[PDB]
Amino acid sequence: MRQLLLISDLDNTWVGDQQALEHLQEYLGDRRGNFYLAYATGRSYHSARELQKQVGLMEPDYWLTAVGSEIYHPEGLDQHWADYLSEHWQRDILQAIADGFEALKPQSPLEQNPWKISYHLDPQACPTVIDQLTEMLKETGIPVQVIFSSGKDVDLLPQRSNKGNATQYLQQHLAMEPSQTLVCGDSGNDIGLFETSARGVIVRNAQPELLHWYDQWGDSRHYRAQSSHAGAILEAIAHFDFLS
Numbered sequence: 001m002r003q004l005l006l007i008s009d010l011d012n013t014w015v016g017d018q019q020a021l022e023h024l025q026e027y028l029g030d031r032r033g034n035f036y037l038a039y040a041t042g043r044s045y046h047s048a049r050e051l052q053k054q055v056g057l058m059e060p061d062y063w064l065t066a067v068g069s070e071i072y073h074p075e076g077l078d079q080h081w082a083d084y085l086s087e088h089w090q091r092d093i094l095q096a097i098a099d100g101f102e103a104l105k106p107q108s109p110l111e112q113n114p115w116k117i118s119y120h121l122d123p124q125a126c127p128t129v130i131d132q133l134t135e136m137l138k139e140t141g142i143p144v145q146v147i148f149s150s151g152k153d154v155d156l157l158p159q160r161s162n163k164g165n166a167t168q169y170l171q172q173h174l175a176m177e178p179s180q181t182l183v184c185g186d187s188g189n190d191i192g193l194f195e196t197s198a199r200g201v202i203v204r205n206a207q208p209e210l211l212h213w214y215d216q217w218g219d220s221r222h223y224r225a226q227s228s229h230a231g232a233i234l235e236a237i238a239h240f241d242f243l244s
């Protein structure tokens, strides 16, 4: 029932520029009840609360963590979303396949969960191996989705997960219109947000994969901010004339 559903990425988007994070949160603090806020990050919920303590993030209404593999309500984890993502998912098999790749190194255990298998790509490896990985996984019949960001982070999630779907799920839950939604991002794990029908803002300092994506799929609901980090978010709000 609010006029805006603000969905932002953390690293290099909401966070990265303190002065901006501060004047963004200062502005949004004078009309806190006019929007719902959701952080969409690739970080675990624990690693996310940590960030909030370091940079002083403002308390969001929802936390779309681990690339949307987990959604945290004020009350707590969403078990319907979990069951939704658990359906047809075969973590063991997918991992067996992913591990078979030399160019891939498993990320620390604390970066994994029932619906998120992550690795790091060798700096000297050939990025096309990701496309080989994607295809090899796809052909298993298991609804899997490969996410590549920052040229090194590789995430294997269910087709039904990822920041964009997590966002769509939330939209329906809150009964919010795409026209009333704004997504903010900078990397490849943000692509799913822009695949959404919501309004979007790509921070100036965006990563190459996102900018590359934009060139090919960017539409009219996609705004390329002139500013970087939090500044992009304030700019996009003025652009789409949100919070009128």
Ligand SMILES: O=P(O)(O)OC[C@H]1O[C@@](CO)(O[C@H]2O[C@H](CO)[C@@H](O)[C@H](O)[C@H]2O)[C@@H](O)[C@@H]1O
Binding pocket: 009, 010, 011, 012, 040, 041, 042, 043, 044, 067, 107, 111, 118, 119, 149, 150, 153, 154, 155, 187, 189
């Ligand atoms: O998703 P962001 O909020 O934009 O954070 C990106 C940043 O997070 C780090 C820090 O741990 O890694 C997280 O995100 C990647 C990509 O989704 C995952 O593969 C990784 O497991 C997760 O911890 C960092 O690598 C990213 O730049």
